[PDB]
Design a protein around this ligand. Structure first.
Ligand SMILES: Cc1ccc(C[C@H](N)CNc2nnc(-c3ccc4[nH]nc(C)c4c3)s2)cc1
Lengths: 340, 19
C-alpha cells in the first residue's frame, strides 16, 4: 500500500503546482449569495453561513475588510491563505468553492461544516475516549503527510480550527499562518499552548513543529486540557521550553509513549522528524487498530456523529450579532490585493 | 488537581492566535 501512497503524492504534487503557479481568481460575485447567519467573528473578520440563490447550496463565507487586513499587517498572510486553499485538494482540508473581491472586502466561499467547531464538542463532553481521539488524530496525520509533501507547514493546529462535518469527519480550516517553505523559517506565529519549543526560541524551525502540535492536540483531546497551560502566554512558554510533561492516570501506556515521542524537545528524536518520517507515527502501537486507507476513504464509522437538522442548520455554533456587509463606493487597497 | 487548575486558568475559552 506504500507504492500507492508514493504514487498518490506524486500526482497530488503535480496537481498542486499547476494551480499554485496559476491561481484562480474572481470565480463568483457577492449578489449570487444570500447571507443567512454569522457563524464566527473576530480578528479574521467574519464567517457567515450563505446560500447560493440558484443552486440552494449552503457555504461558509469568510469576509475580510481590506482596510482592516492592512491595519493588522496581514496582507501577505491573506493573499497566501487564498493561494493555498485554491491549489490544495484533500479529504480533510476545507474546500474553497469560490473567491472574489469588491471595493471594500475579500471573500472566500468555502464548504460548510454543519457539525461545529471541535473546540465546542471537547469542552462539552470534557474529554474524548482514546478511540475517539485516535479517529481524529489519524485524519490529522494524513493531512500533514499531504501538506508536508507539498512543502507546506500548517502552524495553527488546535481544536478551534478543526470543524466537524455531517459524517463526523474533520475539515481543517484557517491557513492564515501556513507557509510554503523547504527548509527553515523563523516567524513567531501560532497559538501559545500549541507552539513547539523551537518556535518560542529565536532559532529557526521546520515542519517538525506541526508534529509537536499534533502531540499537544492528541493530549488535549484525551485529557480535556492542554499539556502546558497558565494564566499568561509567557508563563506557558516557560513550561513548553522546559518540556516537563505529566499525563493523566487514565492515559494508556502506549498513548503516553506516543506523546513522549511527539512532545519531544529534541528534534533528532521527535517522531515525524526522523529517517522513517510519518511512518514512525502511523506504525506506532497506539495506532495499531487504525486502518489508514479506510480513514482516507472516509469508510470508517465515526465514533461521534454530530446532530444535524439540515444543511442550513446553525445550532452547533455560537450566536453572534449580525452586521450589514457594507461595500464602499470607492475601491480600497487595489494595488495591495491585486493578486486576490 | 490539574483539572481544577485548568478550570481556573482563564484560558478555557476559544484561544486566538498570537498577533
Ligand atoms: C465558526 C468558527 C470556526 C473556527 C474559528 C477560528 C478560526 N481561527 C477563524 N478563522 C477561520 N477561517 N476559516 C474558517 C472557516 C472556513 C471554512 C468553514 N466551513 N465551515 C466552517 C464552520 C468554516 C470555518 S474559521 C472561528 C469561528
Amino acid at each position: 500500500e506504500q507504492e500507492s501512497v508514493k504514487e498518490f503524492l506524486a500526482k497530488a504534487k503535480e496537481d498542486f503546482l499547476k494551480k499554485w503557479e496559476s491561481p484562480a481568481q474572481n470565480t463568483a460575485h457577492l449578489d449570487q449569495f444570500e447571507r443567512i447567519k454569522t457563524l464566527g467573528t473576530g480578528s479574521f473578520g467574519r464567517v457567515m453561513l450563505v446560500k447560493h440563490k440558484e443552486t440552494g447550496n449552503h457555504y461558509a463565507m469568510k469576509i475580510l475588510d481590506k482596510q482592516k487586513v492592512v491595519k493588522l499587517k496581514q496582507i501577505e498572510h491573506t493573499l497566501n491563505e487564498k493561494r493555498i486553499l485554491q491549489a490544495v485538494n484533500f479529504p480533510f482540508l476545507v474546500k474553497l468553492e469560490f473567491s472574489f473581491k469588491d471595493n471594500s472586502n475579500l471573500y472566500m466561499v468555502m464548504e460548510y461544516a454543519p457539525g461545529g467547531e471541535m473546540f465546542s464538542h471537547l469542552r462539552r463532553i470534557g474529554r474524548f475516549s482514546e478511540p475517539h481521539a485516535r479517529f481524529y488524530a489519524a485524519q490529522i496525520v494524513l493531512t500533514f503527510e499531504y501538506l508536508h509533501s507539498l512543502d507546506l507547514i500548517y502552524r495553527d493546529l488546535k481544536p478551534e480550527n478543526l470543524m466537524i462535518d455531517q459524517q463526523g469527519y474533520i475539515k481543517v480550516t484557517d491557513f492564515g499562518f501556513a507557509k510554503r517553505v523547504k527548509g527553515r523559517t523563523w516567524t513567531l506565529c501560532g497559538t501559545p499552548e500549541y507552539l513547539a519549543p523551537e518556535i518560542i526560541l529565536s532559532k529557526g524551525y521546520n515542519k517538525a513543529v506541526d508534529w509537536w502540535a499534533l502531540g499537544v492536540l492528541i493530549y488535549e483531546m484525551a485529557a480535556g486540557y492542554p499539556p502546558f497551560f497558565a494564566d499568561q502566554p509567557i508563563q506557558i512558554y516557560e513550561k513548553i521550553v522546559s518540556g516537563k510533561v505529566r499525563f493523566p492516570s487514565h492515559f494508556s501506556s502506549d498513548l503516553k509513549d506516543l506523546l513522549r515521542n511527539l512532545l519531544q524537545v529534541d528534534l533528532t528524536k521527535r517522531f515525524g522528524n526522523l529517517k522513517n518520517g510519518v511512518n514512525d507515527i502511523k506504525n506506532h502501537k497506539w495506532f495499531a487498530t487504525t486502518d489508514w486507507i479506510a480513514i482516507y476513504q472516509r469508510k470508517v464509522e465515526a465514533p461521534f456523529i454530530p446532530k444535524f437538522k439540515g444543511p442550513g442548520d446553525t445550532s452547533n455554533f455560537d450566536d453572534y450579532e449580525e452586521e450589514e456587509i457594507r461595500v464602499s463606493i470607492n475601491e480600497k487597497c487595489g494595488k495591495e490585493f491585486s493578486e486576490f | 488537581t490539574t483539572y481544577a487548575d485548568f478550570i481556573a486558568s482563564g484560558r478555557t475559552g476559544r484561544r486566538n492566535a498570537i498577533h
